[PDB]
From a paper:
We verified that the Mimivirus and M. chilensis predicted PAPs were able to perform polyadenylation. To elucidate the molecular basis of this processivity we determined the Mimivirus and M. chilensis PAP crystallographic 3D structures, which revealed two topologically identical subdomains with a nucleotidyltransferase fold. Thus, while other PAPs form heterodimers with processivity factors, the Mimivirus and M. chilensis PAP become processive upon homodimerization.
The dimer structure highlights a large tunnel at the interface between the two monomers. The N-terminal domain (D1) encompasses an extended strand followed by a long helix (α1) bent at the P28 residue. In each monomer, this helix creates a domain swap, and makes contact with the D4 loop located between α13 and β16 and the α7 helix of the D2 domains of the other monomer to form the dimer structure. The third domain (D3) of the Mg561 structure surprisingly mimics the catalytic domain topology leading to an internal symmetry between the D2 and D3 domains (rotation of 162°, 2.4 Å translation and Cα-rmsd > 2.0 Å). Two of the three catalytic residues (F286, E288, K342) are replaced by non-canonical residues in D3, and an even longer insertion within the helix-turn motif (37 amino-acids) of the NT-like subdomain is present. The interaction with the D3 domain is stabilized by a conserved disulfide bridge (C350-C426) connecting the beginning of the β14 strand and the β16 strand in the D4 domain. Electrostatic potential calculations highlight intensely positively charged grooves on each side of the entrance of the central tunnel, which is contributed mostly by the positively charged D4 domains and to a lesser extent by the D2, D3 domains.
Residue numbers in the entry:
A (entry chain B): 4 to 262, 278 to 516
B (entry chain A): 4 to 262, 276 to 514
Write the structure that this text describes.
């Protein structure tokens, strides 16, 4: 008894959905291609500005990363595997040890060539700067500390240095290894990019065996006590993840199952902590009461390395490392909880760690460790392949070898929340919210006003992500008194370079 | 130089890609669910703030639109067709005739309830305001002129007024009808939403015949000269599109093919055009009619303000108080067209479908019962003619005929949403205008009673653009000037809208 008189028509029937879904991606591509030809700035205008930027990159030997680098390295291997149509405009992202001087020089070149408006601005990502020509984004310039910068491996195509795919793979693994913050917006795209990257640039196979020097007998026993006793403390199990070679041996052991030459001697323990200061204090104290001579215990602190690691420590006995701790506060780290109670990092996490550790050994010119990490990567891929084959399972499964794991330990916050809180901190500190360089404004000024700007540019310092040992006491996160006791420095100042 | 000869291993085999692709959507959902339980603000905190907003919407009778409205109206019809699960967070969007007073009242309620930080901010799209509680977006408040607002049809669910799906359909058609600017970011999602909308709220079937009064014999001949002569001028063919009932008769004619009923053909009450060179067209058309008419002193122009987000400025060129032709402003849009062998253009099928919807809504606001039923019948006839045509031709919804959907061919100069938005910001900056209006209750209640009352008065001195769709009665607001000699010129005037 609602309303009987109503008649309706069927606009879409069953089968129409599938037809549109299949046809839409190509229609959308054609609409994008057409738009590029008739809308200001046109593809013809875009190409001319892009060639100027490319000339600067070529001249300076700057290292291109992101989509453009992945598209070019893939196209070199197989043109049918490209991510860009190369009619459909994309901005160029490049690394630089001097991003603000580069930003000015490139903005000046475009200004003197008759382009207006031309502006270089600070991007959303701090330490990244963007160039806009006629309100259109053309390139991103990212700071890389000099030492790290020269160590980035590239493939030269048409005179341009493109970041090696296996360096770029670290960034896709970083997204996969942040399940609570990156899954929603990055995982589908990260998998797509990783898949085509590895298809064209596959995992290497190494035949060699690892050459790790067995530590001094006392060191070996101290290492053993970190795993057998320190990793038993409930507060430690809930805030720490076993990483490095001990996590690597765990994955090898699971692949053997006993039904062996891949297993390595442990040079030192390596942990990742989400309560960094708390862990370092408790670990230093633990070693102080297990060791023969407590006065022979030292701590070496290291600055973060690029975008790859946080602050770290090396707790040494008689100048020999026992254990290394890495800061992960603010991240929810992917874990594997064992029946023993202790946690290991996930498979994709240890894979990323081996990649970062191999890159660090390459920066340190440590030939022995560079080849050892390379072999560990090869062995980890092999152990995983053998395991999935043996158990007849997919890449996503219910074992320790599963990919796209969401289980993690540690408090975290969304990228959006963190970004808004960072803006509030900048606003409170009376600091510049967004830096802007306009060559029109610059060259209209008097030579005194121009020199006042050129000095201001030189007084800017970036965070210290060199990975170097901390030598300035005011930059150290931990204090060791004359009685050898650990305390956190409450009045620690942010360290800058250069 | 020289690529090395190395050994490689497998990482992804056939068909690991497919396995990941299928499993990822659910893994991502679980990562999002977990994140909402452990990350600040939690789903529990979000639900409490959302209930306060919903209480305000319910008390004020505000009309909800977008995703929330579509999800709720669909669920009412069939719960298995939900566009998203209501466990997870989604922001709410609602229409208002007083969006700034509503924004203040709702921000004040949340402030007095103990929430901090609380801010109401101007959104990226002008006339829309956003509420942020603890750095999280909760709702969007969009301005709708009073007369238009009361005319929006709703479905009441749990005390909340949700915009009728067939009003919301106009907005999805708007996206489809902007191929060069909306294809990339909106078309796939717009199709998905339209499909589920029409499945649950189908196109109606009307049996009735249209009752359009045949114009006076002279008007009929004048109407004919607009089509037979005016539409043949090459600059007119390249800047105008035939719309209204003449474009409707074109689609009916194609459906029947002259050898989809013959009784579907209507008498033309007046010509209706859409121009991408609006002022140029109106001037030329007024001049054309001045020539062809007996007694040019009987020619008048009635101007109309834009209607909501649906139409631009319009004119009605009348003879002896009788309309001959109506012109609609579309400058800045690339309008989807059908170019005939004759040279003149019609709007596309999905374009005329949207026009009939807008025209029916306008007739509803004007309380023009005759035209309201006429446009309703034209919609029913247009869906029927298309269905009959595709059925006989045995073709998909995307085809090479005049009845094809997702057409990319269009006429007129356009620019990206991003470029337009940046140019608008520059204009606001030059004019010394507020770039982004922000209301912070904390700051307000901390201010003196004079400062607080200075703000309350500012909130009354603010004028939105006149999008009432009313006839312009103030001479200073008219876009076209008619002198004592009856000649047309474009009016200068910078500011005023009522």
């Amino acid at each position: 008894n609602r309303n009987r008189k109503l008649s309706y028509q069927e606009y879409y029937v069953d089968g129409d959905y599938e037809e549109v879904r299949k046809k839409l991606p190509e229609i959308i591509k054609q609409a994008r291609i057409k738009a590029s030809q008739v809308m200001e700035p046109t593809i013809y205008e875009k190409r001319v500005v892009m060639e100027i930027i490319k000339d600067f990159i070529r001249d300076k030997g700057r290292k291109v990363y992101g989509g453009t680098a992945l598209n070019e390295t893939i196209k070199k291997k197989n043109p049918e595997d490209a991510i860009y149509d190369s009619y459909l405009f994309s901005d160029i992202e490049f690394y630089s040890p001097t991003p603000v001087p580069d930003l000015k020089e490139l903005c000046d070149i475009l200004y003197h060539k008759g382009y207006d408006p031309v502006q270089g601005k600070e991007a959303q990502h701090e330490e990244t700067y963007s160039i806009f020509v006629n309100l259109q984004l053309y390139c991103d310039i990212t700071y890389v500390p000099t030492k790290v910068y020269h160590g980035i491996k590239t493939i030269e195509i048409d005179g341009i240095n493109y970041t090696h795919p296996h360096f770029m793979l670290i960034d896709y693994l970083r997204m996969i290894n942040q399940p609570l913050t990156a899954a929603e917006q990055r995982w589908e795209k990260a998998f797509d990019r990783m898949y085509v990257l590895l298809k064209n640039y596959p995992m290497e196979k190494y035949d060699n065996s690892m050459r790790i020097t067995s530590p001094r007998d006392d060191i070996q026993m101290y290492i053993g006590k970190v795993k057998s006793e320190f990793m038993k403390i409930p507060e430690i199990q809930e805030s720490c993840l076993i990483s490095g070679f001990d996590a690597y041996n765990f994955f090898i052991r699971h692949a053997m199952g006993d039904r062996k030459n891949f297993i390595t001697v442990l040079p030192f323990m390596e942990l990742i902590s989400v309560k960094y200061k708390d862990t370092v204090e408790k670990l230093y104290n633990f070693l102080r009461e297990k060791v023969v001579n407590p006065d022979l215990i030292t701590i070496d602190e290291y600055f973060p390395l690029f975008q790859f690691t946080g602050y770290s420590v090396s707790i040494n006995y008689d100048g020999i490392p026992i254990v290394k701790v890495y800061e992960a506060d603010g991240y929810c780290v992917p874990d594997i909880k064992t029946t023993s109670g202790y946690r290991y990092v996930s498979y994709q996490y240890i894979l990323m760690i081996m990649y970062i550790s191999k890159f660090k050994a390459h920066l340190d010119k440590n030939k022995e460790m560079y080849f050892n990490y390379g072999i560990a990567i090869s062995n980890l891929v092999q152990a995983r392949n053998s395991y999935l084959n043996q158990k007849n399972i997919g890449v996503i499964n219910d074992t320790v070898f599963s990919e796209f794991r969401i289980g993690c330990i540690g408090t975290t916050v969304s990228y959006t929340r963190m970004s808004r809180l960072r803006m509030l901190e900048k606003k409170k500190q009376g600091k510049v919210i967004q830096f802007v360089y306009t060559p029109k404004q610059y060259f209209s000024q008097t030579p005194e006003q121009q020199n006042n700007f050129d000095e201001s540019m030189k007084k800017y310092r970036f965070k210290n992500t060199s990975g170097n040992k901390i030598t300035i006491p005011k930059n150290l996160l931990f204090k060791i008194d004359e009685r050898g006791n650990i305390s956190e420095e409450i009045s620690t100042e942010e360290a800058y370079i250069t």
